[PDB]
Design a binder for these strands. Structure first.
Ligand SMILES: [Cl-]
Ligand SMILES: [Cl-]
Ligand SMILES: [Cl-]
Ligand SMILES: [Cl-]
Ligand SMILES: [Mn+2]
Ligand SMILES: [Mn+2]
Ligand SMILES: [Mn+2]
Ligand SMILES: [Mn+2]
Ligand SMILES: [Mn+2]
Ligand SMILES: [Mn+2]
Ligand SMILES: [Mn+2]
Ligand SMILES: [Mn+2]
Ligand SMILES: [Mn+2]
Ligand SMILES: [Mn+2]
Ligand SMILES: [Mn+2]
Lengths: 97, 108, 96, 84, 97, 78, 92, 103
DNA sequence: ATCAATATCCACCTGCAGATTCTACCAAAAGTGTATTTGGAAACTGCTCCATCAAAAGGCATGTTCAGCTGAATTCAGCTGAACATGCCTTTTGATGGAGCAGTTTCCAAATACACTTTTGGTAGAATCTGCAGGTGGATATTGAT
DNA sequence: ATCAATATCCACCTGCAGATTCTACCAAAAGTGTATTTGGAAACTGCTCCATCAAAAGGCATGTTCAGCTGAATTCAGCTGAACATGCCTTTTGATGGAGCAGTTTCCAAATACACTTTTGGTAGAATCTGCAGGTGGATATTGA
């Protein structure tokens, strides 16, 4: 009237949503171009198998999702609920990266 | 030559005792290969896939599906303390993650 | 122009019927399984290789695969695998 | 064909946010989207470099999913589902 | 009567201990501990003078390296005092838990 | 025995680790981590000892256990 | 007995610091080092040949293995030192 | 010998016998024992060149394990190649987080 | 920073002890010159796969407005962990003895690698078969203004 | 402690994309007979490893006395969700042209396999330095004032 959900409610809706699914959260075409950009910047006239670009997105999204989990722990240990660059660098550092 | 039983049958296994015996010699793991290694190694391979499929298949049950899929394989892996330890560094394509939120994050 | 490439699918599916008779397995899921099997087969033989080597021993026996498995697999998982292998081996020597 | 540049900005704010969700993240500071693309760039950079190193060595022009699988394995970041 | 502010001695110890390489655990107490832990896996085992030291060596590098990270977390939590939470956070992001 | 690893020894370690102030619960928290570490490594080492049919654990068993536990040690053979 | 690269490290030592000396404990660090590197490189060349179906490890492998393991700049010098080593060899 | 021919101070021959015997492939090229030998020598000189510096820096002529530790840890590139390696009696590089400093 | 009194810490020798560097000689490689053997680099070529392209729909990325409630700045005080002077029992030394036990080695029977021949279990595709994905529709179950 | 606006639920549908069931051919297990080879069973055997004896001198365990830090309260400025409107860029479809794998055959250049004969790297045993561990003496870094 106009009805509106409160800050955090929808976020939690999405967390619960994406944890029950397993589809790639990053858009395809946009990701293929990034793969081609970087590769091409190491060697040229390179072709990519359909599934090669896919074996990368799977690994990439599985890395970040897993990194955001660690990052979350650091924020929560910082008595916060909002993740920040600060936490990613601490996770990666502890991770030995 | 009379009847020729397969080494797997002689072992009582479903996995290929011959194929494994072969994958070994051409893998360059050592110069020679005793006849009981491919057998013993095929026996462990089968037991493990049997353990994983059992939980996976249970995963599929707990969700009205009758065909195992990646997501089911993952739920089994991340829920069995053991497999999880055995494959903590393995990432399963199309598997997703275990539903789980930190408490501090839920509302009052 | 053959091209044929092996796979463990035939054996995974057999074992599947044994545990869950009423259940089928999607292709992508069988894909994960093969990877899983080659993975472990690699971990175990690799360890086996290393073990037989550390001992100036030129052969990988049922005794290597057995240590490889104890070093590789944790607790129960290991205790059962070790049984299944022994059982399978003695059954094979008994020429059974 | 056409010059590829700035494709990292292709990994949009929406997409990343989504990944944090799966990762169980509730709130995201404004600065995290760019620190993410950074991390993401390095990750791909390292995996591709090795994938490609495997291609150049096999005398190919086509990077295979096997090249990528072998590259991730080296990174101690093993993948299942494309092994074949 | 002369006294030092709490912390002053600490820093002195930190600096001293980052210059030396000697093992920071008493040998015997440790060799006694090793024989025990190992006693529950096999019986009456002998130990090379070098096996016991290999462990002590590897071991002390694990804790030192683990206190390093633990400290980053304590500091990340805007504290200066490490606590089990920090050791717990570190070992987890590391994948040891 | 694990109580053999003294408080000051743990303090000394953390010092090398750059730790200024130590909470009182760290000490018992450290010993468990210490034990789990040694249980994991010894179990692997003795599995090589036992495999090589010997009654003595050698630096080489420790070195190989550590190598495969991801704790490569330089200085005792390999 | 128990052979070790020990004697060679000393030689190489002398070329860079003919005035310096090394400790028995430091010498052990240098062998564990050579063995490690030796394993990781041998290892990848082993794998490389297997992915491609080859049955012989050749300088080609050893070099791609080096590329894959040694950090950026260190890898180059090594690729060089290594390509040189073979040239001088094949020649005479 | 093959090493003097390759011009190396490292046992090309011995390296060859180790490759063939450590199960790596059925065959082994003639240059591989040479190449790998050259590669093992380069990295060796590099570390020694740095550890030697580190000893001199400390007013010493004999390189101990501590010198190999300071030599490696203080090099971004050897560090990256040995990050998962621990040098016995190496100790750690001196480093104290700012916040921990007085005043 | 001042003025002073602790302790701490940095330096320039000093002098043995203990690792080290340098000798003196022997098996186990490492080299050689033959004698095949064969792995995999060319020389096309069949033919999957990939890079392009056009096209119409609409599923999402983009910006902007609004303001809830989160992160960061402050003030505070109970009380936890540091700095110490104290007192002692247990870890560090260290020759010595005694002997378990890694190695060494020596055979030899069981266990393997070879080789040349068959003999089927698999795999690449036709063919038939059926979970369930994507659509609806209630009916529940969850939020949040009041 | 309601009620209204959504979001979630989960039972029913229905043939399509994606299984799983035959079907056909070999690539590769399984078959026998040889020609080494492995690596255990007894014997020993020097050599590291426990166990002793037994003290000395530390460190480690204790009990005080605060200096400081950590964690609890309070605020509030404004960063960062939730919602909404607009419309762009990805999706999904359906071929197409070769770019470049994967395959099939030829042929050395190069590797393995013996046999025979230099050399070298590894032992023990001398044969000596590099620094540790300790003294003084002298500025320093600290904490009270
Ligand atoms: Cl930040
Ligand atoms: Cl066997
Ligand atoms: Cl805590
Ligand atoms: Cl070669
Ligand atoms: Mn069942
Ligand atoms: Mn051939
Ligand atoms: Mn406001
Ligand atoms: Mn707050
Ligand atoms: Mn005896
Ligand atoms: Mn058949
Ligand atoms: Mn549905
Ligand atoms: Mn007070
Ligand atoms: Mn062409
Ligand atoms: Mn000599
Ligand atoms: Mn001194």
């Amino acid at each position: 009237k106009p009805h509106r959900y409160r800050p955090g409610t929808v976020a939690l809706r999405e967390i619960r949503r994406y944890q029950q699914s397993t589809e790639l959260l990053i858009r395809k075409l946009p990701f293929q171009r990034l793969v081609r950009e970087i590769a091409q910047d190491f060697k040229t006239d390179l072709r990519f198998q359909s599934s090669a670009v896919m074996a990368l997105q799977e690994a990439c999204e599985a890395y970040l999702v897993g990194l955001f989990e660690d990052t979350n722990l650091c924020a929560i240990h910082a008595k916060r609920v909002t993740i920040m660059p600060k936490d990613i660098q601490l996770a990666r550092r502890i991770r030995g990266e | 030559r009379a009847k020729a039983k397969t080494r797997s049958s002689r072992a009582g296994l479903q996995f290929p005792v011959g194929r494994v015996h072969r994958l070994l010699r051409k893998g360059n793991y050592s110069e020679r290969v005793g006849a009981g290694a491919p057998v013993y190694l095929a026996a462990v391979l089968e037991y493990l896939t049997a353990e994983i499929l059992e939980l996976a298949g249970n995963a599929a049950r707990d969700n009205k599906k009758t065909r195992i899929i990646p997501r089911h394989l993952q739920l089994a892996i991340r829920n069995d303390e053991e497999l999880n330890k055995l494959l903590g560094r393995v990432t399963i394509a199309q598997g997703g993650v275990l539903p789980n939120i930190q408490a501090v994050l839920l509302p009052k | 122009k053959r091209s044929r490439k092996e796979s463990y699918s035939i054996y995974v599916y057999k074992v599947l019927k044994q545990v869950h008779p009423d259940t089928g397995i999607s292709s992508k899921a069988m894909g994960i399984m093969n990877s899983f099997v080659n993975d472990i087969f690699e971990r175990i033989a690799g360890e086996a290789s290393r073990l037989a080597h550390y001992n100036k021993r030129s052969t990988i026996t049922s005794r290597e695969i057995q240590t490889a498995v104890r070093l590789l697999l944790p607790g129960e998982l290991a205790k059962h695998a070790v049984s299944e292998g022994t059982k399978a081996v003695t059954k094979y020597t008994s020429a059974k | 064909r056409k010059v590829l540049r700035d494709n990292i900005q292709g990994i949009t704010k929406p997409a990343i946010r989504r990944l944090a969700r799966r990762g169980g993240v509730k709130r995201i500071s404004g600065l995290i989207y760019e620190e993410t693309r950074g991390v993401l760039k390095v990750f791909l950079e390292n995996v591709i470099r090795d994938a490609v190193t495997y291609t150049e060595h096999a005398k190919r022009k086509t990077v295979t999913a096997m090249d990528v699988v072998y590259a991730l394995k080296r990174q101690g970041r093993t993948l299942y589902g494309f092994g074949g």
